[PDB]
């Protein structure tokens, strides 16, 4: 199989900047190389085929270059809609093989998150589990740390989190973390706290509630 390697795996660029990303094959692929853009939850969209041929309807700021093993895609001047994941495909031989993708995101100013904590609902407690949720709203850059504490005991291994992407409406990230406890354990403790560390905060921010207090 022909191995396709893309670089960088991810990067940021500012509005209007020139962007060049690379795709290298483990042998000469005779310019049978295509480039694609993909947005979250959506199919690939073909940009360029045979290394340098633009698909009709693709803006001319996109161009492709290279031969042999080494190929590149250039965005001459980045537009906001160009965020997404860029993939390359070789179709010189079978199997057709893909690169691992390059994620392209847009630079913007630092933003500290606003933080919110949510107790488990009475409706959920009826059935034996408690989910405590911590929201980090609209922050940049993406690196953020959530630490959960229950009566000052650091929780580890009992939370999961996920993060939103930039899109047409948002250039910041948001993050949701869920701490899961049994109802029995939830009712044994009082102070539920989410502590957030982020570069935009002078010091970590803690949001907390006391179980059973309005």
């Amino acid at each position: 199989d022909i191995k396709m390697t893309q670089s960088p795996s991810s990067m940021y660029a500012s509005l209007g900047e020139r962007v060049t990303i690379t795709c290298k094959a483990s042998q000469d692929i005779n310019s049978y190389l295509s480039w694609f853009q993909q947005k979250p939850g959506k199919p690939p969209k073909t940009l360029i085929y045979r290394a340098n041929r633009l698909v009709p309807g693709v803006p001319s700021r996109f161009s492709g270059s290279g031969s042999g093993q080494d190929y590149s895609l250039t965005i001459s001047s980045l537009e906001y809609e160009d965020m997404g994941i860029y993939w390359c495909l070789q179709y010189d031989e079978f199997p057709r093989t893909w690169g691992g993708g390059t994620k392209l995101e847009i630079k913007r100013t630092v933003a500290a998150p606003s933080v919110f904590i949510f107790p488990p609902s009475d409706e959920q407690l009826k059935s034996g589990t408690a989910s405590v949720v911590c929201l980090l709203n609209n922050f940049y850059p993406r690196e953020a740390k959530v630490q959960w504490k229950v009566d000052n005991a650091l929780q580890s291994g009992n939370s999961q989190e996920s993060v939103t992407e930039q899109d047409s409406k948002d250039s910041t990230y948001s993050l949701s973390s869920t701490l899961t406890l049994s109802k029995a354990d939830y009712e044994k403790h009082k102070v539920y706290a989410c502590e957030v560390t982020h570069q935009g905060l002078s010091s970590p921010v803690t949001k907390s509630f006391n179980r059973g207090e309005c």
């Binding site: 959506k42 073909t46 057709r96 893909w98 609902s121 959920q124 709203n137 948001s174």
Partner: protein, 216 residues
């Protein structure tokens, strides 16, 4: 305009079979060679199968991972390409796309190979906090817990509220069920006067829920 539309996906048990179909329009179908490509978080994009046009007598080609189990075929009179998948494996899970000449793509169809049963979600409120004081911004949401398989969608106020909404990627819990949250930020001063309803759809279980979220 070229259009492609895949159908036939859903949940199927390991060792089972499933047939995908791709309906095409907007090009001369019999002259086009076609491919199936699948995608997962774990493996990225993977080419699955190709079927030629008349120029190579509709030659077919397969990824080694699916050879002997999958069959690509076409019906030119129907402008359809098909993928018959037998002896399915967990690692065959993914979003399956049909493409014409690697140039135009369908929207994809999600194939989940799992022994687990379909389960609709419970929807719990993430209620706006009583501490607040107004002239500020409050957050509220819905926790869509314990469903299988993906996906779920969430809207607010039947689509009338979109600014400030964040609907997060689901997490797979150790139980094997997914959980997802959706939140919105709104003026704290609005909490006594505005109604907020999350509209949750889990099509795999035919489950729809509208959950009003109120303080306290």
């Amino acid at each position: 305009e070229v259009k492609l539309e895949e159908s036939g996906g859903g949940l199927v048990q390991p060792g089972g079979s499933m047939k995908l179909s791709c309906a095409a329009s907007g090009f001369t179908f019999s002259d086009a060679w076609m491919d199936w490509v699948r995608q997962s978080p774990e493996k990225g994009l993977e080419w699955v199968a190709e079927i030629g046009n008349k120029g190579n007598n509709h030659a077919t080609y397969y990824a080694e991972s699916v050879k002997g189990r999958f069959t690509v075929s076409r019906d030119d009179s129907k402008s359809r390409v098909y993928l018959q998948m037998n002896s399915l494996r967990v690692e065959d899970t993914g979003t399956y796309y049909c493409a014409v000449r690697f140039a135009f793509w369908g929207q994809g169809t999600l194939v989940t190979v799992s022994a687990a049963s379909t389960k609709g979600p419970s929807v719990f409120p993430l209620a706006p906090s009583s501490k607040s004081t107004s002239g500020g911004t409050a957050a509220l949401g819905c926790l869509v817990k314990d469903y299988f398989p993906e996906p779920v969608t969430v809207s607010w106020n039947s689509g009338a509220l979109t600014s400030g909404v964040h609907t997060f990627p689901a997490v797979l819990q150790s139980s094997g069920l997914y959980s997802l949250s959706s939140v919105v930020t709104v003026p704290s001063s609005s909490l006594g006067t505005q109604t907020y309803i999350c509209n949750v759809n889990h099509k795999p279980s035919n489950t729809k829920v509208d959950k009003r979220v109120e303080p306290k």
